[PDB]
Design a protein around this ligand. Structure first.
Ligand SMILES: Nc1ncnc2c1ncn2[C@@H]1O[C@H](COP(=O)(O)OP(=O)(O)OP(=O)(O)O)[C@@H](O)[C@H]1O
Ligand SMILES: C/C1=C/C(=O)O[C@@H]2C[C@@H](CC[C@H](C)/C=C\CC1)O[C@@](O)([C@@H]1CSC(=O)N1)C2
Ligand SMILES: [Mg+2]
Lengths: 362, 88
């Protein structure tokens, strides 16, 4: 009778039981296959053999694109990670902003017809993160492994006409750090070496408040350079790579994208909303996702938004300590609300209407 | 004339008196300004998510009584001047 919460990311699955403080199961959203003879392994079991296996990510840029492999991830989630029978548990799932209607229907079809869930619900990831912050109005910056979104939300509901999508997130930043590390003579190329650079990115990168000055003083700076110990015991040293990497979020041309940066897409998103709610959005900028973890990102965002907004506008950037999992925590909170029990889509209702019911109740 | 309600922690709607001291950071309140055909939904800074969610639902039902009134969600610390004059 306990509800399940599953947040399917491009990089990581966050799954657990409604009412838990945090996701019990966090594991890679991959399916690996051995190269020879042209079975499969899911999640942690795929990475444990990352050498002999070819990896596929079933979710790309937050959108499910490989449904057979997605089914394996859901089966793995239920039976291996959570150790439940899905037909016994209402299941709350998440989706990306602007998820196509056919995808939402397919997800519902699979949950009821393949896994026989007794009930389910699909919620927008950014909406859950706002709820987790204690708000029903605000604008969320959700940046994970595969996609970044700006999502304005008013009185509980996202405004899809004003949502911005940016195909720039943590995986692209890791790839960029790999590239600029060649300037110090370092070669990181393989899948495993990419994982090392991801860890370097997470441990040593930060967002400069004034990028241009940070660059110009990088030479004379005593404390910019940091060391990192590799698995084999070898040490590397990096300097301005620490902040050039996540600067890409504000200057996507660093990787050859001419999209605006996340500060500008935040502004553009707000400007597509009605004048009378912009003040509420400026005062409630909530960040979520692993790629908003960089030290300094909130202060830089405050600075940039202030330069674009009206001079008298109250601006506040909220970066919760739990933002790596706030989407999941929001779903735990929602699925535990007594008022939400009417919002579940039951098997009875699916058998009557079919997958189209998800558009009406979600 | 002006009325004032409160959305409780146990979901009820209760009337309250509609001036100055009723404001408190942990409440969600509704004020009906008949002169301006406006329903103010006031949320305090420390209002828990589930009163905010239900404050939206309470304002919508009260608005069934006055279907052409304007519904204006407002927040502690940044209320419109018209609202401020309304109470003090
Ligand atoms: N401390 C950190 N600093 C910088 N980046 C981090 C940190 N922790 C995690 N990340 C990055 O966040 C990404 C994973 O975050 P998250 O789980 O929110 O993504 P996701 O939800 O799987 O992807 P998406 O939401 O884009 O589909 C990875 O790229 C990881 O490198
Ligand atoms: C600890 C951890 C973090 C993460 O975000 O991992 C996810 C999922 C992972 C899947 C491949 C990896 C070999 C398996 C598990 C690593 C999971 O790919 C990522 O590392 C990708 C590749 S590099 C990067 O920055 N994002 C992100
Ligand atoms: Mg995510």
């Amino acid at each position: 009778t306990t509800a399940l919460v599953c947040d399917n990311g491009s990089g990581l699955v966050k799954a657990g039981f409604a009412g838990d403080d945090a996701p019990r199961a966090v594991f890679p959203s991959i399916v690996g296959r051995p190269r020879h003879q042209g079975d499969s392994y899911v999640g942690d079991e795929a990475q444990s053999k990352r050498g002999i296996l070819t990896l596929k990510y079933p979710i790309e840029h937050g959108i499910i694109t490989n449904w057979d492999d997605m089914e394996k991830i859901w089966h793995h989630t239920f039976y291996n990670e959570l150790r439940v029978a899905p037909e016994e548990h209402p299941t709350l799932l998440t989706e990306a902003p602007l998820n196509p209607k056919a995808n939402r229907e397919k997800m519902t079809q699979i949950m009821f017809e393949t896994f026989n869930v007794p009930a389910m619900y699909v919620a927008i990831q950014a909406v859950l993160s706002l709820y987790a912050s204690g708000r029903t109005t605000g604008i969320v910056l959700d940046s994970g492994d595969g996609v970044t979104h700006n999502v304005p939300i008013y009185e509980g509901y996202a405004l899809p006409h004003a949502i911005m999508r940016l195909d720039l997130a943590g995986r692209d930043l890791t790839d960029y750090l790999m590239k600029i590390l060649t300037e110090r003579g370092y070669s990181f190329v393989t899948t495993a070496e990419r994982e090392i650079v991801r860890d370097i990115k997470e441990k040593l990168c930060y967002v400069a408040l004034d990028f241009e000055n940070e660059m110009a003083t990088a030479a004379s700076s005593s404390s910019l350079e940091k060391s990192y110990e590799l698995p084999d015991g070898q040490v590397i040293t990096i300097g301005n790579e620490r902040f050039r990497c996540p600067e890409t979020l504000f200057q996507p041309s660093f990787i050859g994208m001419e999209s605006a940066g996340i500060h500008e897409t935040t502004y553009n998103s707000i400007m597509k909303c009605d004048i009378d709610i912009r003040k509420d959005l400026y005062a409630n900028n909530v960040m979520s996702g692993g790629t908003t973890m960089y030290p300094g990102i909130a202060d830089r965002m405050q600075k940039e938004i202030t330069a674009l907004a009206p001079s008298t506008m109250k601006i506040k950037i909220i970066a919760p300590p739990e933002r790596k999992y706030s989407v999941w925590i929001g779903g735990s909170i929602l699925a535990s609300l007594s008022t939400f029990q009417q919002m579940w889509i039951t098997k009875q209702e699916y058998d009557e209407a079919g997958p189209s019911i998800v558009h009406r109740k979600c | 004339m002006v009325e004032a309600f409160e959305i409780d922690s146990d979901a009820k709607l209760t009337e309250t008196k509609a001036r100055a001291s009723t404001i408190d950071t942990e409440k969600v309140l509704v004020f009906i300004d008949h002169d301006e055909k406006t329903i103010y939904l006031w949320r305090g800074a420390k209002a828990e998510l589930f009163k905010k969610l239900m404050g939206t639902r309470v304002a919508a039902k009260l608005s069934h009584n006055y279907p052409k009134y304007r519904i204006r969600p407002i927040t502690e610390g940044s209320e419109p001047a018209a609202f401020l004059d309304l109470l003090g």
